[PDB]
Symmetry: D2
């Protein structure tokens, strides 16, 4: 069922994953040489063995795989932040999303997945090299069909109209507030990710100026604690990622 050119997740015995394109070349590993040609005509769930006899399993790549293994220009918007943006903004299949700060394309890949083949994500970017690398990430993930990158400064305006969500992770989201109020559907969401307290203060004040266009804003911070579970001791993992950014939501009119 797998043909040349298709993408595949190879899982080694230790649980390490390789998101691979099937082709006539021999992939090198910790644990021997895979001949990726042997994968043609196999099914997901079958295995291939390296030259030293270690078994690698073939999985269909999912969004988590693409997200986990893309070329990143550190940092990004993290899974957990993307998650709450989706939840509290209620992003849905079919939604039309404008986003600014395409970066590596991480938030874009996640949002593209949520809106499906019939949703649209339009990403703004001002940095040429980030646009060229994001686009390569989005083609690689197959979202080629639903995402458009505009090499354009969103501060100067939003061309689009009747958008479901404006989602931002750039330095000054306050400079987009006025444009978002025009672009957004009634009941549409303005969403911003900001690492600093200062950015929140500014944004909240701008959103107060635009009380007539937005509902009362909401700013959250998400923490995720991994648990270390064993036979005897169950306890939280000693260190954790405590802070990425704040997320501010505001409903339109």
């Amino acid at each position: 069922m797998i043909r040349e050119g298709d993408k595949v997740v190879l899982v080694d015995p230790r649980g390490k994953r390789y998101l691979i394109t099937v082709s006539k070349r021999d992939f090198h590993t910790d644990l021997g040489i895979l001949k990726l040609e042997e994968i043609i005509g196999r099914n997901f769930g079958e295995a291939i063995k390296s030259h030293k006899g270690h078994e690698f399993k073939i999985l269909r790549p999912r969004i988590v795989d693409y997200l986990d293994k893309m070329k990143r220009g550190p940092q990004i918007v993290h899974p957990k932040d993307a998650a709450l943006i989706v939840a509290y903004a209620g992003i849905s299949p079919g939604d039309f999303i404008v986003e600014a700060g395409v970066g590596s394309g991480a938030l874009t890949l996640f949002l593209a997945n949520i809106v499906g083949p019939e949703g649209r994500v339009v990403s703004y970017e001002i940095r040429e090299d980030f646009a060229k690398l994001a686009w390569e990430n989005i083609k690689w993930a197959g979202f080629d069909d639903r995402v458009t990158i505009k090499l354009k400064d969103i501060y100067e305006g939003i061309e689009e109209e009747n958008v479901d969500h404006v989602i931002l992770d750039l330095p000054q989201p306050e400079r987009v507030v006025e444009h978002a109020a025009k672009a957004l559907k009634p009941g549409g969401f303005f969403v911003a990710y900001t690492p600093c307290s200062n950015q929140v203060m500014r944004l909240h004040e701008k959103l107060r100026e635009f009380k007539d266009y937005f509902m009362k804003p909401r700013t959250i911070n998400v923490l995720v604690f991994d648990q270390e579970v064993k036979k005897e001791c169950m306890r939280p993992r000693t260190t954790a990622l405590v802070h990425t950014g704040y997320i501010t939501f505001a409903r339109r009119i």
Copy 2:
């Protein structure tokens, strides 16, 4: 555009949301009486008035309104927990999900909206009053098309096959592990939400025993702090919801 029988969200000046089916009747509010018939023939983004001069904005119902306004039992799975289920398990449009513990239909509604018209959710439930209640909400939210509620003890087995995700909020997820291993696609996710660390210990024991059926399980705990942001003062809100439940993820072999 708005016709009889459609569902609409009315927003009052304060920002109180009313989820209403538009029909020929009068609706009684703390800001006076409304005639829903005046909504008919109008478009989203427009306003109707009350017999005290107070305006009511008309918005298209989004998933977040349904989750906010549905009938409930006591405990539920909160948006943040479902958010991370979605993010960490890679729940995508078109997915086939098995969930047990429908309860009030909160989680099921969340997942139904993520999977889209072409995804499917099958929910098991042992408690006949909950099943009726949950089904009441999904027809109401319009996910009629994609959701099926089984009145069946999931511990007896999972009749579905090639499922993308098995997602549990029930007292003993360990008693579903063997079943889910057979039901899940290669690469699919077992996901369990458990309030106590006892549950997690027991569940981790079962997954340990099924080592050759799942990758290394990870267990997480998610906290969300709201921020009180004023002109003079930005502090985290004094009080917060600090624990709902632990979430455990395991990918199938």
Copy 3:
């Protein structure tokens, strides 16, 4: 034995405490009337019974009982914040402490307990009613031996010299930095408690300006989670106190 005028802690069957003054007057309770005079001749570890038959145990009042049961114009600086102030700044028996913001006298009580009968806490306060209130609180607790309340505005200066610590919980702690710099012993701690980010920002501004007077400042934030532990279920408590204030520490060169 216990005599008239002694202060005592009555613990009821449900574990509830009552800090009481022993005297010929009968005290009214959920569980019946207590003849407090019957607590004369009795000793710590003994009990007395209400007219409804219920037994109240007699304990020696400790610092936690005074802190837990005093008259507040709430909220105070919470015992979690005061603990970390003590621990991080090294507050020891015999210390000479200047604090400003006597308020209810809660912080003052805590530090007074720490410094001991031979230590000194000098508390500044600009409000006559608070000063009366707190002084009544500290008498009540037996600390009038070691605490001084100066009805004076600390922004105008600190009369004391060679102080161990300057501990602040007032709105503009930056206006005390210079005075604290000159009041503190070498190795003495400037400590401020500030509910808002904004206050931390200004206080960091001022401490940068006086870098030649202070080591690098450190701002913490402390959360305490309660656990629900029962035979079956052990989980963190659902709701917690998430924020009181930030605490900044600065060592004098």
Copy 4:
């Protein structure tokens, strides 16, 4: 004023501290030889110079210095946890404390500082090399007067009686419960520090068997978030110490 044999902290133009016993010798350091003969007869707040020009400040050793610079091999109980133990148990000058797990002496130092010259700390230990290292640390910090270490297993029993607090950092505190019930004064505190949920569950089980000797227990967990305050950005430190141990408190009768 400062004579031979006394202890002194040296602060350099970076901020780093060195705690030494003052005696005539060319002290080897990163910024050049010190020669601690220029220091004798000086006062605190003065400066002494090396051969490379730079200046070193003389500070009086506080409890924070001893806890920083001590030989601290084995994992300590953390300052934040010591703090809440002090706070919630109401540990006061002059208290009599039995503690088990002397470890390196860290928790023993901190407690010995709080109970003061007239308090007593009896530390139990079963490991020789730990006991030798612990006694060598407390003598160095000057608490020889108030601390005794017993090379004896606390599970076998508690020799002392009428004690203020039993403070534990060992693997099975539930075995010390009955002994503590005998040793503690009316209103005294049993305090145990456990890194695992399991340990807490066992302990709570024992404490409830001893409901007639103890008030309902209270288990807590403390987190400290460091704040990053730069001129143009305030945010929490990205990473933070999230879990060290749970702490359980119970009042005797």
